[PDB]
Design an enzyme around this catalytic site. Structure first.
Site, PDB file in Angstrom:
ATOM      1  N   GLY A 183       0.807  -1.208   0.000  1.00  0.00           N
ATOM      2  CA  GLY A 183       0.000   0.000   0.000  1.00  0.00           C
ATOM      3  C   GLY A 183       0.842   1.262   0.000  1.00  0.00           C
ATOM      4  O   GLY A 183       2.055   1.190   0.201  1.00  0.00           O
ATOM      5  N   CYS A 211      -4.204  -5.125  -8.689  1.00  0.00           N
ATOM      6  CA  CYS A 211      -4.278  -3.683  -8.707  1.00  0.00           C
ATOM      7  C   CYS A 211      -4.599  -3.091 -10.066  1.00  0.00           C
ATOM      8  O   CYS A 211      -5.113  -1.985 -10.227  1.00  0.00           O
ATOM      9  CB  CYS A 211      -2.974  -3.059  -8.164  1.00  0.00           C
ATOM     10  SG  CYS A 211      -3.074  -2.869  -6.415  1.00  0.00           S
ATOM     11  N   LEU A 230       4.362  -3.342 -10.391  1.00  0.00           N
ATOM     12  CA  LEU A 230       4.068  -2.404 -11.463  1.00  0.00           C
ATOM     13  C   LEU A 230       4.375  -0.997 -10.971  1.00  0.00           C
ATOM     14  O   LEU A 230       3.665  -0.458 -10.136  1.00  0.00           O
ATOM     15  CB  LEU A 230       2.610  -2.542 -11.901  1.00  0.00           C
ATOM     16  CG  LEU A 230       2.312  -3.589 -12.984  1.00  0.00           C
ATOM     17  CD1 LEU A 230       2.960  -4.895 -12.650  1.00  0.00           C
ATOM     18  CD2 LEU A 230       0.796  -3.789 -13.220  1.00  0.00           C
TER      19      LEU A 230
END
Ligand SMILES: [Mg+2]
Ligand SMILES: [Mg+2]
Ligand SMILES: [Mg+2]
Ligand SMILES: [Mg+2]
Lengths: 453, 453, 453, 452
Positions: free
Chosen positions: B198, B249, B417
């Site tokens: 996160g 995500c 990513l």
């Protein structure tokens, strides 16, 4: 606001907000428009190279005007030529058979931390690569070099505007403080930090919560193998080492010399302007290299005669550098550390293996990941020696100052030399324009995903 | 128990010292010896894909075993295939015209932070790219996924050992704690942090004083233009969105649909398993999408039926995803945020320009720099829509889950990513093996430095 | 070795948990049970005073055994007598006309930070006042005195225990580390910090999140007025200044002497063992007083002959102290700072006003809020001189070492001297047993509150 | 707006420098000149009590103007009377037999942190005791009470100055920020922090590097023993609990009642304005006492009718307080926590021993070291009950609001109630003027130092 720390914080905030607006305008321009701005900036740096050089020497007391002028021209010419043809606007690559194309994306606002040793040249260099990649840039000078750093930034911005760039694109903290540096590195609007400074400032950059390209220090050991062209090697070393009186991090710090040619190398060094300190002169010079456990700022970038005087020794007026023979390596041995001045250590070695072991030790005293050198005509020896050296720039048959920055060997022209993971850096590259834009990939579906195993 | 924090610190210290010794051994091996190790690791992941999948579903409560198995196989097959032929040992390139050799240099010890959503696949992915570049790696699990993460690391190390790797190369924290995460990120022996987690944990990694490759969160908007093959588009979107019940995500979060094909799109979505919530149902679901002002972890990776039960509504047993027509965007409009579950917002737009403005607003709610999608057969619309999107992965006519990670479009296969500067990251690349070694350049003198101006 | 930091943290945690349990047991005892425990402790200190003195001299190299022996006896006798009759259990005061009574409440667990200069005596003094107030105490030694400090704590525990005290009541960190000091000061079970140490550690104590009693450093100026008994004042000064070779913070650092008795005082000083340095010798001694910008640790608590040798001068073997005539005050004038050794500065003054001016300047150099002294038989002068001096201990006609701690003047016997707000402390008191219990007030309704204005 | 943080830091630095200069001038005054300044301050506070009260109720939403007027008068009257004859200039004590004098030494500059619940009264109290001890003081208001707090400060300064005090002696941060709070607490020129606020500000004060007097929160349990005068206990309890609608930290939060008198106490409470919630009503009120695992700010200092509307219950107009019977103690039981509003918990106990065990558990929920109460006529039970309670204020036969602050029992009048080491405070005292000067001792040689 009355107090200088608060004022400097407000100044950083103003600059960043103005930079944000300026970069939005810049990002909309065509490649031609960008290239015209970069060209005008490079032309002004060129015209201003001497004057900026003289400001820097007068303000900092480091180096000499002729060499700082060349450093500024290196930024205005070599750096400019290495980026002028790089595509940085829109689609920069198409790959039809993979059905992908690449789009250049500016990082936004760059925070440039500028060293006291290379203040004007680093501004020119960073301004060129940042604006070519379509970014704004806000500079933080070293307090010893505040005025010349700021003047270099102003010249770049004014040259940029003349060619159509927006106001506020390039700025510089006028009143450097810890508070302002901290604000610049942590602010919401700051996108990327280029931290060219001491290990502590770089550590702060990698503690900032922001993406950062830092550097590491050098302590460059150079091996002269018995196959070397000794006159040429000595010439290259002396020109590189004495350049701006040794202020560049990639400059030679120790020579490692095969015992079979030591007498010839010494004689050649003496002939080309080196003064070999005797045991007593060495102790006296040694005692001013370090004060209170680190490098004495008062010798940084000073002529050999000034150093001689400080140390209480007596040398000829035509001496170009001081050399001392050495056997030990470590912080307790001042001639083995990074000296940032026209002083060289001289180690005798039996052969290549002993050279490598000494080189590794010297790098471990504050040079990991930066630069090494070798002078040799035997490719086998060059290959076996270089392969395992922890340095991003491994300079062969060239001065390490000029090789490291990409003047005389083909690495990218740069004044921000990443020292890799071993140096606590994100890259080992010579930092350049491709580090200041992201690549976006537009990619088409070319395969089907199974949903049964 | 009182001192699990101290014990977890000790454990980190033990892993890093063992990792140091292991990496030194690894670094001495040939390319073929390295490649045999990587291959054995890949083989073991493939064989254990189902068992790791099952551990991860049961321990975390997220997703389903079929899709997690596919996710592990993506790491075991797609990632392996993309790195197996990369040169990573010794001299990887000789540039004869520029007189420069490139040497691959391992970064050393990687700290691998692992998310709770993709626990075992990320371990497989990171272990393969770390070892192929000749590094050791120490993993840090999310506490809700500690056992499956450690088992995945265990399996990677045993596979590597079988093919000759040293003990201690690949390790994983068994007792996750704040103290241990902190120790791992800041320890003297840690060289690079790969931080997949996160925004909080990534910010910590960029605050650690170490070089880091972070990620950013996704909030992926997908445009269906009137020119789209609607049946195929919906199929790609549903397959991607419901994959592992929406835990990735890069997965779709909002559809933007041309009014002219709205009714066909809605009907096609219904036909393929979407349930459109009415106003009363929307409000019930919206109530459990976030608690406080953040995404509710209890719906992450949950089947539609579980979510329905939680929100106290009832839906058919064959429903594959919930859809909710929406007009507003913002943190306070729970359907517009990243939902990490089989819930999809549905926006009506008049054309491409309105689609771009909404896409831009959705990305600003926690998706900048990550991924966008578009479905279209009109090439000029594609070109016009894609050029200015702030996303590193711009996926055309594919599911964004599978496109983003490089399964079904040609970006590098990866589960890390990078979202570039706009998302507080050092790169926008799909992170892969080339991010885990430095390049050292052996460069020969090819130019003379002018002595004067 | 690597994990000594972690072990020392675990050690502190164990001591605090055991202390909590011990203190619970101790709090239930009667006044007579407590007093028996305290008496046993004081007798053990009295017996061990010579042995602990010799240990401390041996381990720290400061001072001498005879004087450290008296320092321990000060704690075993003077401190003990000042607290043995203080009521600390139950109701300690009844005010029948105000309808209030006071109840003594132990603070619970005390963290005691111990200096290197007074390591065993401070342990004795603190253990006595803590246990008398029905608290547990956990000690933290200076690293250069860890062994003798721990041994002093052990003797106190075993003596307590022989008289019926619980195990774990008194403890001491055996391997000091920064981590352990931090853990001790900040731990949830720690109630009150007694911080006796340099300004850095005291600052840490006031940053701990915990209630703290700190000290400040001394730089004690003493005024000899022309009305003084010169032979007696010089005797008092010399005995105090040379006590333990000057290790105590309250010891004289500068004499301020009326011009009119200058020659008599000089002669008296020489007679009683003072050696006045000439200009040559002054400069040599000054060279070793400060290393960097602070006091040289190698002169602390050293006999004048050791200091002479260190400075490379020769002085007679019967010299008790060195004296240097001075005119300047400031942190760059080494004879004006706190010297913690048998060195005394010597200023000439025209009279009282110039003496006051100089004393204020001298306290500003690291003595604020600590101690001052005057020798005089003129009462009017005493009143006018003392009224406005910023020191919690204003010593008249006594040696300041013995006066400040309460040996020879009537302030509470103590080795923890608060320097008040001006010295960054919560109290200007000599810390003693009343600082280590809270008072609870049982109070009856005696007035009615108005309901309306 | 972007840089209010920077402006607020500069404001603090300006106040501290002016404070420094002012305190230097003040320190030279005679006791007589100081006492005149303090008197003038107390006079102005008295005159402005109602006006300040109205501003504080309007700004904060807490309490009511009548009780806030009384709270300001307590500071202007009771606090003034407790300090006006204290010696604070020069030599304050002489001892010929021990040959020692004591000299009062001002601490210098006081940083006064002011809560939102007692904003104007706490400024009046702190200014009086600080200036009486010959200090300057810089106030830091809670953001919810910034204007009334600054006005209280302005009034004190004006009053002080009228009686000869120097400019800059008493000041107040006008725009509260975290930056400004951090600056005031850590600044070089700050000498002592008086931290009256929540455990978080108090922790910050003991983490500042500076000497600090903090407070801790209350959660005051009150035992009604079967020997009590019930009608009188109830009256004292209700007057204290409902004062300013329950905003004072010393206010009753739970009653522990002897089984044998339970019915009379309940009846007497109802008769005197208590509304006892039924089980359903209890659950609804509980639901708004706590928000996100902590006390809901929105019920603080609110009338019971206001609390009733928020909870969705219906109560008569003349109700003075809500009461719920309770058996459990813990954060997961909202009626057992400190409520800072006209709500009481009601526990039945078999006798003193269960009352003590319950009282201990209630204090461990955010009350340690603060205040406790007992109502009883049996002196032996009083002695037995009180001896082991960890509270610096143990109030007998009095309302705990007025007892704890020293209005109605003889503890020093104060609005800064130190909770001792058990409450993470340096003292258990009601903080007063003596905490704001150091004592210097002039001491003469009376003994010889030996050898061997
Ligand atoms: Mg940004
Ligand atoms: Mg490393
Ligand atoms: Mg405690
Ligand atoms: Mg001060």
């Amino acid at each position: 606001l009355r107090d200088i720390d608060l004022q400097s914080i407000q100044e950083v905030r103003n600059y960043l907000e103005e930079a944000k607006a300026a970069q939005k305008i810049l990002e909309k321009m065509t490649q031609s428009e960008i290239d015209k701005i970069v060209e005008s900036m490079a032309n002004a740096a060129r015209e201003e190279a001497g004057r900026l050089a003289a400001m820097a020497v007068e303000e900092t007391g480091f180096g000499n005007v002729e060499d700082k002028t060349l450093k500024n021209l290196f930024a205005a010419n070599d750096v400019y030529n290495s980026i002028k043809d790089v595509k940085t606007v829109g689609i920069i690559r198409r790959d039809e058979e993979n059905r992908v194309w690449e789009i250049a994306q500016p990082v936004g606002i760059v925070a440039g931390i500028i060293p006291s040793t290379n203040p004007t040249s680093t501004v020119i260099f960073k301004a060129l690569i940042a604006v070519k990649a379509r970014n704004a840039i806000v500079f933080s000078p070293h307090p010893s070099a505040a005025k010349c750093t700021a003047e270099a930034a102003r010249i770049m911005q004014e040259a940029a505007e003349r060619a159509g760039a927006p106001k506020g694109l390039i700025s510089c903290i006028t009143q450097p403080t810890m508070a302002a540096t901290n604000e610049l590195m942590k602010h919401k609007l700051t996108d990327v930090i280029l931290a060219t400074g001491g290990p502590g400032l770089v550590k702060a950059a990698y503690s900032s919560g922001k993406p950062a390209y830092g550097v590491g220090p050098g302590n460059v050991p150079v091996y002269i193998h018995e196959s070397a062209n000794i006159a040429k090697a000595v010439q290259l070393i002396i020109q590189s080492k004495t350049f701006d009186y040794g202020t560049i991090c990639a400059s030679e710090q120790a020579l490692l010399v095969d015992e079979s040619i030591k007498e010839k190398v010494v004689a050649e060094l003496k002939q080309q302007g080196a003064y070999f300190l005797n045991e007593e002169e060495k102790q006296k010079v040694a005692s001013i290299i370090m004060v209170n456990g680190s490098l004495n700022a008062k010798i940084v970038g000073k002529a050999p005669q000034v150093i001689a005087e400080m140390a209480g020794i007596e040398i000829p007026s035509d001496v170009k550098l001081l050399v001392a023979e050495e056997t030990e390596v470590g912080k307790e041995y001042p001639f083995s550390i990074e000296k940032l001045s026209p002083i060289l250590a001289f180690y005798i070695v039996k052969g290549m293996e002993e050279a490598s072991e000494l080189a590794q030790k010297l790098l471990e005293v504050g040079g990991l990941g930066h630069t090494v050198g070798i002078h040799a005509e035997d490719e086998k020896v060059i290959e076996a020696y270089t392969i395992d050296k922890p340095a991003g720039r491994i300079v062969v048959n060239a001065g390490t100052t000029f090789g490291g920055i990409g003047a005389t060997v083909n690495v990218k022209p740069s004044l921000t030399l990443g020292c890799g993971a071993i140096g606590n850096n994100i890259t080992s590259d010579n930092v350049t324009v491709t580090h200041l834009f992201n690549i976006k990939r537009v990619a088409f579906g070319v395969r089907e995903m199974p949903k049964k195993v």
